[PDB]
């Protein structure tokens, strides 16, 4: 849904493609340490 809208706005048609919804890290240590990158 909304793929063409996202395209004309400048975002990925599928939000899983790129952007902060997928590129950010999905887990880090509670002490504030950065987790290693995901293979994806």
Partner 1 sequence: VKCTKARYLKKKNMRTLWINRITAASQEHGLKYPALIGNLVKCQVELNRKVLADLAIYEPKTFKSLAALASRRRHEGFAAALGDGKEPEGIFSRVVQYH
Partner 2 sequence: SYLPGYVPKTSLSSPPWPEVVLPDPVEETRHHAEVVKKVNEMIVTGQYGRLFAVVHFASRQWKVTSEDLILIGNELDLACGERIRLEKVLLVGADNFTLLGKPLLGKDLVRVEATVIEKTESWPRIIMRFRKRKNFKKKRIVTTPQTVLRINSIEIAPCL
Angle at 12 between CA 7 and CA 16, to 5 degrees: 150
Site string for partner 2, 1-40 (x = CB under 8 A): --------------xx---xx--xxxxxxx-x--xx----
Q: Does 24 bind partner 1 (CB under 8 A)?
A: no
Q: Which residues contact 29 (CB under 8 A, 6 or more apart)?
A: 35
Question: What sign does the CA torsion over 21, 23, 29, 31 have?
Answer: negative
Choose among partner 1, partner 2, none what residue 28 binds, the Cβ cut-off being 5 to 8 Å by kind: partner 2
Residues that bind partner 2 (CB under 8 A): 15-16, 20-21, 24-30, 32, 35-36
């Amino acid at each position: 849904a909304g793929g063409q809208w996202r395209l004309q706005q400048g975002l990925a048609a599928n939000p899983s493609g790129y952007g902060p919804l997928t590129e950010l890290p999905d887990w880090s240590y509670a002490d504030g340490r950065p987790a290693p990158p995901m293979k994806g």
